[PDB]
Amino acid sequence: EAYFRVESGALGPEENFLSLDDILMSHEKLPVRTETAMPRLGAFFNAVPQGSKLELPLWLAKGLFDNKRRILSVELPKIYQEGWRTVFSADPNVVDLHKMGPHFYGFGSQLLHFDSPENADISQSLLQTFIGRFRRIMDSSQNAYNEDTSALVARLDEMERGLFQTGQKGLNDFQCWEKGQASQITASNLVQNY
Amino acid sequence: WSLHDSLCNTSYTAARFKLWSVHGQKRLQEFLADMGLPLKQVKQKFQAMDISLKENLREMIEQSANKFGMKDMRVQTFSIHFGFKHKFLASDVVFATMSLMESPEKDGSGTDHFIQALDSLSRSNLDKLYHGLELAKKQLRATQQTIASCLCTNLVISQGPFLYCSLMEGTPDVMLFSRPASLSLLSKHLLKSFVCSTKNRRCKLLPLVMAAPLSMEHGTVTVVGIPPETDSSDRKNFFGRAFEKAAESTSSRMLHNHFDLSVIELKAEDRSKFLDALISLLS
Amino acid sequence: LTPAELIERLEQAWMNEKFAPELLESKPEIVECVMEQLEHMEENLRRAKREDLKVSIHQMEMERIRYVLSSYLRCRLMKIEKFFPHVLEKEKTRPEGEPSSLSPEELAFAREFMANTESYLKNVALKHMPPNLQKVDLFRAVPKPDLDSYVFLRVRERQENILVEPDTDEQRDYVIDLEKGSQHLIRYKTIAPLVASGAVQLI
Amino acid sequence: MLPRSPPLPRGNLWELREAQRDYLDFLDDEEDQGIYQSKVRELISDNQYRLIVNVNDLRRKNEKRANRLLNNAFEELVAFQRALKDFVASIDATYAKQYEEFYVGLEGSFGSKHVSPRTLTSCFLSCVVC
Amino acid sequence: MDAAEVEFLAEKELVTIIPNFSLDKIYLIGGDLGPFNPGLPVEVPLWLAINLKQRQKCRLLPPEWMDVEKLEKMRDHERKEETFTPMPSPYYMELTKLLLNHASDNIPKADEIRTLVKDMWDTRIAKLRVSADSFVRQQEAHAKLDNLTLMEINTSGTFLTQALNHMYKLRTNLQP
Amino acid sequence: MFCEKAMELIRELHRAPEGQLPAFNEDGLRQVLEEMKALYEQNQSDVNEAKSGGRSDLIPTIKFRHCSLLRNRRCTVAYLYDRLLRIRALRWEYGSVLPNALRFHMAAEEMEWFNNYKRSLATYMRSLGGDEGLDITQDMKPPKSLYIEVRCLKDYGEFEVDDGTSVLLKKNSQHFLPRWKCEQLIRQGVLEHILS
Secondary structure (H helix, E strand, C coil), X not given: CCCCCCCCCCCCCCCCCCCHHHHHHHCCEEEEEECCCCCCCCCCCCCCCCCCEEEEECCXXXXXXXXXXXXXXXXXXXXXXXXXXXXXXXXXXHCCCCCCCCCHHHHHCCCCCCCCCCHHHHCCHHHHHHCCCCCCCCXXXXXXXXXXXXXXXXXXXXXXXXXXXXXXXXXHHHHHHHCCCCCCCCCCCHHHHC | CECCCCCCCCCCHHHHCCCCCXXXXXXXXXXXXXXXXXXXXXXXXXXXXXXXXXXXXXXXXXXXXXXXXXXXXXXXXXXXXXXXXXXXXXXXXXXXXXXHCCCCCCCCCCCXXXXXXXXXXXXXXHHHHHHHHHHHHHHHCCCCCCCCCCCCCCCCEECCCCEEEECCCCCCCCCHHHCCCCCHHHHHHHHHHHHHHCCCCCHHHCCEEEEEEEECCCCXXXXXXXXXXXXXXXXXXXXXXXXXXXXXXHCCCEECCCCCCCCEEEECCHHHHHHHHHHHHHC | CCHHHHHHHHHHHHHHHHHCCCCCCCCHHHHHHHCCHHHHXXXXXXXXXXXXXXXXXXXXXXXXXXXXXXXXHHCXXXXXXXXXXXXXXXXXXXXXXXXXCCCHHHHHHHHHHHHHHHHHHCCCCXXXXXXXXXXXXXXXXXXXXXXXXXXXXEXXXXXXXXXXXXXXXXXXXXXXXXXXXXXXXXXXCCCHHHHCCCCEECC | CCCCCCCCCCCCCCCHHHHHHHHHHHHHCCCCCCCCHHHHHHHHCCCXXXXXXXXXXXXXXXXXXXXXXXXXXXXXXXXXXXXXXXHHHCCCCCHHHCCCCCEECCECCCCCCCCCXXXXXXXXXXXXXX | CCHHHHHHHHCCCEEEEXXXXXXXXXXECCXXXXXXXXXXXXXXXXXXXXXXXXXXXXXXXXXXXXXXXXXXXXXXXXXXXXXXXXXXXXCHHHHHHHHHHHCXXXXXXXXXXXXXXHHHHHHHXXXXXXXXXXXXXXXXXXXXXXXXXXXXXXXXXXXXXXXXXXXXHHHCCCCC | CCCCCCXXXXXXXXXXXXXCCCCCCHHHHHHHHHHHHHHHHHHHHHHHHCCCCCCHHHHHHHHHHHHHHHHHHHHHHHHHHHCXXXXXXXXXXXXXXXXXXXXCCCCCCHHHHHHHHHHHHHHHHCCCCCCCCCXXXXXXXXXXXXXXXXXXXXXXXXXXXXXCCCEEECCCCECCEEHHHHHHHHCCCCCCECCC
């Protein structure tokens, strides 16, 4: 109630520095093709050729990128390719955005700092998927009371679980006021140890 | 409860009907048949019984109990309604509270059950009352299975001026009555069944004295004393003096711990040393 | 300023801080002039205590006001401890003639908080580092407030010609007007100077 | 793993007049990129009855019809197969009479219709499923 | 916010009681009250009427808008109109909860007032999730809520605003 | 790639999203400072070596190592900063003094941060009003009535009433006290508000 973690800026211009969600977000891998040799460090993948397909975290490919593609170029995973961008248009209420994740909107908004050609078509997928999956989170979260919700929440990602936990915290708080139950003073964080 | 499981357990029709001896269990059958109550509706819970039977139940039962020698069958009490389905008689609250405070399985100090029973008297806790009605049932079905023991085995000794009984640990559901407060009711129902059962004319007017083991480690039992039973008994007990003077004479180890005097804890070895001097003292 | 109106304005100063996404104005006047009614009517009770019902009617109201006020203060010591560097900076470079966003006492608390946390990070992990990283700037580690939030508000001073920008396209902006007593759902940036001028109130 | 498309989406790189007059307009297809006028002819050169359609295209062209076709499949597929004979007579009327009636398959990505014989309940009556 | 503070703001509404004790004017930091003449009406803030009722010292009175006839017309007016229609008091839910729980025997026909209030509530909540779905569905940037009371706002606000922020972000991530 | 050790500090705090302070990790912290030093020197060598022979083709091998320390910096300040949030809570929820099931999990320098924060807070609080200000730590929920009925749950030596009229607190024994005093103890676990 007073532990206010630093929130995630993974949807705006640039992720926050201290947010433990973005730190684990950017760690996810991404495919690149190198433009030069990689001397003195070919141990991991001593030198590495130019024109080689490698898998690197996102944070690494932040500074190793330039406009001229001096060191390496990037190509998007298939989840954001043209293939799946039609699937997410058929009916977005069917996809398991936890397997295709578990950071869909967080990752996809950082792949816009690579000035690829099809950006005007990724920032339209996300917008049209989130709008598609809305009337199923506005209604399965404000209307699921004293139920086992661990199956209404099995196909969501970190940007959506944060909202499914705000619908419930406002349902279970009006239903606790209606029943004269939110008058008793209780232990706040000690019942967490118990 | 159902209408059947509450005739077999009220210690006022479980005495008259003698619902512990197969010879008189058919009396219950005849009583039910004289009213037109199917034996399949009487066995089902009362809230689910058909609506066409329960019209004048509380009259066709008072009537057909004259034909059997039970004329004090209607009493005067009160009842409360809260809402849509909440309907209590003032003698259901009592049997539920009295059994939340004296639950057998102990979960802490002596003042852990007291709190849970004080809780279940305010309307904001109908989940304890509605729970303390499943203990009060479990108790009442485990009392007619003890008064059925000491009357199909004749453990009521006629030790002279007063009857006498005792209990055995090996019998099931005898650790439930270990408390020195839930033992008075068992004895007071035992006397009511007995006085109706025996054929003598002397035993029908002698007070009872009962003992059941309290503590195996200290090796001690608990003892009570109840007035001579009758219909119009004045209810003026007299054992708080008898036990005192008897322990004084024998000079044994006793404890008058409670507030009422007629309940004592006694060494398992001073039983006879105490009892003989008491027999002589009451005379 | 009848003592009856201090409370009516205190509740209003209490809701805004609960809903706003940024540390709003500082009202030292009120916080220092309600601690007077509390300080006074705490004396006309401990003296004339020999009534047993009047003192109850007074103690209950005192306990209601001392919760409005207290929970108002607590709601700002959360804005300060989450945005300490950006709230120190803003107060250092303030153009004279602008109401501060920090009391003279919250200012000392914020100074000591920044000092304490810097002197803590200096001796655990920023000391044993290579000797060019041992300085981290806390204007790019503590995220700034987010003034693009949506808020419900109800207006009480008829406004007209309010700009509503849905997106980046400057053309798509249609201007709107506001009645009195109405309620709307708009982004906090386009109505920022109205909350500081009493024209609205974030319900 | 959920098959939400017949073309595996991971590695694909390596009255009744409105319906009939909207299907025809969809089957024109000339002015944008000529995707289907490259297929009608293609099948006429192979002597086929039916042609496979991508509903993914119907969506981008006209959403209303793409939804009305996945929920009233009968009245819509009797109007599709009419405005297909109409459009094949608009290329070669000699061929358009060799065959009694044409047919039209489907393929693409249906939203919730991708069901298994275990999930095929009775809320899918008269509805294209896969 | 949270319901237990809307309930705090709602205990400032005025109601009318009938005391049964003698007391002279009281000068509260929020006005004046009294005098309390046994057997004579007087108008006080709720948080005092409730607290005096619990201590068996008064007898409440039903507010005028709390009539079983005018309410049976509000309940129909609400279902006819297609926008949020004006309501008796800005805090009717909390009034008809606190009153009917604490003074249900001084209010005739409590269990019909209660059902009509609940009928109104269950509609004004249905209009919200339609007015909060067209918003997203059409990607608006403004929405005039007409006569929403603070309680309806607060029951589904901390979700709606938080799910509109994540939409503004997704809609303005291509400009730079 | 790199940074597989720092990412074992974070992927542990991310498993406790309730706000419960886990045991400090001096081990992993030392283990990541060591890698910082190692890469630092092994890169500075070739840095000054690219000015002593012209190996400018090693420029990539600088960035791949220059940035790959910034990471290990982030993932060691965040952890060190996150744990400074889960600590300040223990001043608004438990109270001024903590039981040693907590003061045993904090690293020995976080106690100094605490005892500084607590003292600055108690300084600010006493500054609000004329007489010893206003203790804003209490009063977390709107006041409902003027007296409260509590019921003890553990033993506690001798609770005080301002007028010197103490009260013993045995287990399962309920009083009727002003809620102006019981708030501190209810919110910890000692007492309990029964007559809701």
